[PDB]
Amino acid sequence: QVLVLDGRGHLLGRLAAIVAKQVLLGRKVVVVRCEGINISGNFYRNKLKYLAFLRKRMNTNPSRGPYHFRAPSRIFWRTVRGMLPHKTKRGQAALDRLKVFDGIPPPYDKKKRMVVPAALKVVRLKPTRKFAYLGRLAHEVGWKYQAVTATLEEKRKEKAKIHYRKKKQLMRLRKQAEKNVEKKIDKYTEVLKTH
Amino acid sequence: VFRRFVEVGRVAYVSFGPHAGKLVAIVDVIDQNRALVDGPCTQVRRQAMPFKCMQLTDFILKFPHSAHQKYVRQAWQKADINTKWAATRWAKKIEARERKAKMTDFDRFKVMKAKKMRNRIIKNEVKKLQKAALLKASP
Amino acid sequence: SGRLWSKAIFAGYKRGLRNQREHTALLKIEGVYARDETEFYLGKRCAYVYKAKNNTVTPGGKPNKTRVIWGKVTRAHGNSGMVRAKFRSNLPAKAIGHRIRVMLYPSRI
Amino acid sequence: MKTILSNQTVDIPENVDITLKGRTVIVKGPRGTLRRDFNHINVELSLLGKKKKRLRVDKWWGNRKELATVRTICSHVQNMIKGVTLGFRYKMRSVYAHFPINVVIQENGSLVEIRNFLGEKYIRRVRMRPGVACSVSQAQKDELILEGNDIELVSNSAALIQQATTVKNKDIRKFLDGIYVSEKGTVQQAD
Amino acid sequence: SHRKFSAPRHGSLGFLPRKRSSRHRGKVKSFPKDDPSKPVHLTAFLGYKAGMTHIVREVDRPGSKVNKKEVVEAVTIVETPPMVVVGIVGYVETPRGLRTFKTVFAEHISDECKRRFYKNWHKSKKKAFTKYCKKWQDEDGKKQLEKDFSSMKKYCQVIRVIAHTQMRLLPLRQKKAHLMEIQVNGGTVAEKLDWARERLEQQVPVNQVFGQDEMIDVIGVTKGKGYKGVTSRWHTKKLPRKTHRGLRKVACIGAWHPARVAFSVARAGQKGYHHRTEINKKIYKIGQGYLIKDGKLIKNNASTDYDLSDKSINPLGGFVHYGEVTNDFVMLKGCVVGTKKRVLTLRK
RNA sequence: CCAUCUGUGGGAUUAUGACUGAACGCCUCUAAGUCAGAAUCCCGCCCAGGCGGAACGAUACGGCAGCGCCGCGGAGCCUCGGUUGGCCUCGGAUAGCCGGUCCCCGCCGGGGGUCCGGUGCGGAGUGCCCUUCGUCCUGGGAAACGGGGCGCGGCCGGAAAGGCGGCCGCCCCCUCGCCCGUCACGCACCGCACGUUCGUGGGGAACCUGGCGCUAAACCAUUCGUAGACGACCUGCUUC
RNA sequence: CGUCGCUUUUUGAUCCUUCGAUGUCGGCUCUUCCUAUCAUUGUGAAGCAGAAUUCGCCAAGCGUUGGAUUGUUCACCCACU
RNA sequence: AGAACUGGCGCUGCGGGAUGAACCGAACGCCGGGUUAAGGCGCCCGAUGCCGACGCUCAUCAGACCCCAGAAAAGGUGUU
């Protein structure tokens, strides 16, 4: 049906190289909390090539022309717009299946997000080289919604920690409830055969 | 942090390549990313291997520096590595992970009809714990 | 009752970079991701089930709105293990991304 | 060159005890406590030995440029062990020309208001880093004594008075004003 | 190339889309953003301009060649009848800005309130809110109405107030109430909404929001001047008399190779009737309009303590193209955007 | 400007100046790490609001229909795509995880010893539904919550795009709601494809069919002139 | 004394395109951009005491006029700045 | 601008060089299967989704594939 990618710790283009291929095959990929996306190189360089990106502007009127989106959901969304053949109808309908969400919505906060170990800052960069957030280069340029985005995360991470406490509260039983010696036989058939 | 190392005389699991699954003993290192390993009682002979091919264990050994197969064959069987490798909780995993591969199709029907039994035995008994802790605090 | 076909999307045509060759599709079945392990799927008979306006069906059942384009796996393709296949028609190019149906016929093992 | 291991060891005196979260160095001394997490440097900290308290910092595969910075851990530990027991006293003397540099301190040693600097009619309120304190220097004229625990909260704040007193649009080879750091000592002497 | 004698741009590109504004009422773009310490008070307010007079006051400003001499200043007076607070509108804030959470309107609503909900009051059956005033009387719909305040207190954060003007107390012909929607910058959201449910459909005078000699902002729509050309719109210089086909125009509207007219060049369109915000207008006097019993009638407006006369701020002959002020007013200093008889909002 | 009125602040930083501090036993503004910093750049304020989204109001009987919701069958017409779902920690990477007495949080959990496991088995290379062909005779293990649902009724739960999630108590009903054995039966359509599921899908129009309901606005014409090239806009028309 | 480049705002060399026509000097009017910055902001250096100056750095946000003779571009001059 | 030896465009498409007269491959009846050439193999875009090998490299103006599309002297206790 639908896959729900988490966005923290991932690089920008290394994720959207994967996302743009899994969307031209017919799946629906939803990138969730794209606020915390790492990007390569030190912060001041990535800011310059996004500040110097802002002057890309047709001279006779800019209302027509280069639509600089500023929110870090539509930063990542413009990157997949580059790596799709979006002029054909084969590429217009590859943006009908991508919905990158800034922060985490209520449709998807009670879903289980996935991560891709081909685009992670953990796996891919050498640990002695600097990185930059899509969080605070998008806020530094225009996107005026940084405070009310992190404010809603602690209301999500409040109703998550009480859920993670209560799932392991439910899980603590089924190791101790499994303690009864009554059901002995149905484990001959699985310790032998990959319990 | 870093509770085990590489060392002259360390048993090392080998992850991939032409020697997957077999154990080797790190005997001597050469340059920054390769070794000179061997296994006498596990059918993999003295040669050089990279370090990203192998996979460290908790089995130190007591060798000289880069001795022959005559004195590795002693400390391999004197330590009884294969028994100590088998009855640990990491060759009970890789063997069961390949016990599921050679699990045949009639065997899966023996699994599925017996898995769906015990997971119902636990549920009508974990409910008996979901009721004897609410009844603690009805008032 | 129960699905008796391995899942498979339709991935493109057998192309160079400019021109494409229409005569053989190439697939991406769900599950193989290496050429070394696609040897099961060589020769399996694959079908493109889709919908249209009238009826025309084959068995004892009355015709309803389904029709199909049969076909078979030709050979392997690439290191990542996708599979090209030669149907007895050409694919309508609308089916890009939507699944086809790789059966269990041609079963040697 | 890619050297196998580079290391320095750190003694800890018995009056103080470092415990660590990992790369966070929780130092609890007599006069205060302080801490510096080091998540930028990727080196392991291993305290070792009872009754002796040796701290050992060791970086296994650093490039000349990361073999460089294993000393920067242990040199930044010995400015907490020396800083939590002694604590840093900085003494700056105002070199004043014909116009005397006046100064008062309002909010418990944290707001320094610097008037009559070089005849200017402007007051410079230079609030300090949180944790440090000032002094009207007793038994010494026009001196200003800064105390605290962490040296990079002291000296950064202590530089904000030498830097804020700047003679602009003039000569700086002549016209020598400002309250320059002249003595970098500790609170407890000879200890 | 390289103009040889520099000039600045005629007109400013920050006001650039010179449009007939899509509104007649001055929309407040941004209210003052509050601290929760200060008391429970409003921001913006409605008033209609009527005309202008001037003034003579005794300035006090030591340091100029002006101090303690009589100084005339051009003033403008703006008539404010008391409002009636009707709706309570609560806003939740998102990662996409604000969002209107839900609203509550007052129990019974007045006659010019219902006149905004139609484009024809004559033909229509006047049937707005007839099935919404029946959720206050019933206790079936009452507890799901106060359900919409305790939820309003729990989630949404920047609540506002719907009010409008009283149009029986003006000399206009208009009689539609200009419904507004203004923000309460009170304390916490407990005290912010606790102050409004008590005071739905009770009035708000102008001397309850504004203090005299505090300098405020005006939002209004400019004087509509028509379809005017370049030398009257961007004030580009007239060409000399010998010019063929036309004098009152810009001559060269761009270079060759950008083969495309820039937006930056000055050309003709619709001058006037734009939306503007005048910044920093001091209020000179708050007036009280036609007082009650004792004496046949009392005018007593514009009766300063250095004048001592039976006068009122309606000029002799009444205001030109407005009428005659009977009510409270606000006299600003200077020029204020709009025709006479035009709605222009004040704002803290 | 030939008279008058008004024009406003924040953030990351450039250059530069420093701090601590190695590289290099000393020195160092830099290599890791920190600080000040401006007509710059970004944003506020101001102007326009999008093949973008909210909130609320009103919803067409008269002499006749009609039009909504909830429970309704029955057929026609069009669009096509899918063959089971995971209902959620935070984050760490020179480490993190589980189980745990004690002190600190309005009788439960934030803080430390202590005990496990770690190429992750309290393992989305996994997990649970599950491949349940139907049904009967007929035995054993498992089973005191019965489970479909027009239910009936209460409750509180989830605002970032809530379009959902439980509990408790009663109700036409069942004690065959699982696993293993005993007994055979059902289209066994005679080798053969478009099988099985989402799904009593989604869209629009009629006829016999049950209840609860509702009985209005737009634009023209007229008028206004706060507006006007025309359009548009601003307004008015009560039997006082 | 040398020596190494850059820019196409000078002139020249070349003839690629246009000869069934690209309307060719200047000025007026007007918008935008360049930085190799005259003034302004933030700094550094001086054979910088102050004041007046000069050379460098980030920098195109802002300004860079009125006049006599000339068809003038350029010039030169008066005068504010 | 002008010559010498050979080849090519001119008369010529096709795969490649992002596009291109001449460059590198290769020269054409109409097509089914197979394999390669110069080229390439993160996504546009067929193919590295190989558990590729060994190094070098931090750029507040990175670099990135013949002809071919913007550079030198001199200098650096950057670093090997």
Side-chain angles (χ1 to χ4, degrees), chain A residues 173-183, chain B residues 122 125 129:
Chain A
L173 292 181
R174 67 97 49 84
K175 184 170 285 294
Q176 193 272 334
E178 50 217 13
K179 158 276 289 290
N180 297 185
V181 64
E182 175 181 34
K183 42 197 70 306
Chain B
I122 294 171
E125 195 270 339
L129 291 178

Side-chain angles (χ1 to χ4, degrees), chain A residues 102-120:
Chain A
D102 195 2
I104 305 172
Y108 292 140
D109 54 357
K110 290 182 173 65
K111 293 283 183 69
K112 176 60 185 172
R113 58 204 65 244
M114 280 179 274
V115 292
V116 175
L120 284 169

Side-chain angles (χ1 to χ4, degrees), chain E residues 3-6 8-10 236 239 250-252 264:
Chain E
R3 306 175 68 234
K4 286 172 92 286
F5 295 103
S6 173
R9 173 79 177 89
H10 295 292
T236 295
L239 295 175
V250 57
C252 174
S264 170

Side-chain angles (χ1 to χ4, degrees), chain E residues 163-182:
Chain E
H164 57 283
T165 54
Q166 288 175 352
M167 303 302 287
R168 290 182 180 174
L169 299 179
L170 295 173
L172 303 185
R173 205 266 318 277
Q174 191 180 12
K175 295 187 286 186
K176 280 192 172 184
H178 282 272
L179 195 72
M180 204 181 175
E181 199 270 342
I182 51 180

Side-chain angles (χ1 to χ4, degrees), chain B residues 93-138:
Chain B
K93 294 193 289 187
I94 57 98
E95 188 178 5
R97 190 179 295 115
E98 64 92 16
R99 277 175 181 272
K100 195 171 176 65
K102 63 177 172 63
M103 181 177 70
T104 175
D105 188 76
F106 176 68
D107 195 83
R108 188 183 298 116
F109 180 77
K110 290 192 284 183
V111 169
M112 174 181 65
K113 296 295 286 293
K115 186 177 181 181
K116 74 189 286 183
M117 177 178 172
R118 55 88 56 100
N119 291 119
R120 298 299 189 191
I121 294 173
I122 294 171
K123 278 174 94 287
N124 292 116
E125 195 270 339
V126 75
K127 186 181 90 275
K128 286 193 282 187
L129 291 178
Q130 288 293 320
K131 181 177 65 179
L134 294 177
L135 193 143
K136 178 260 291 180
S138 294

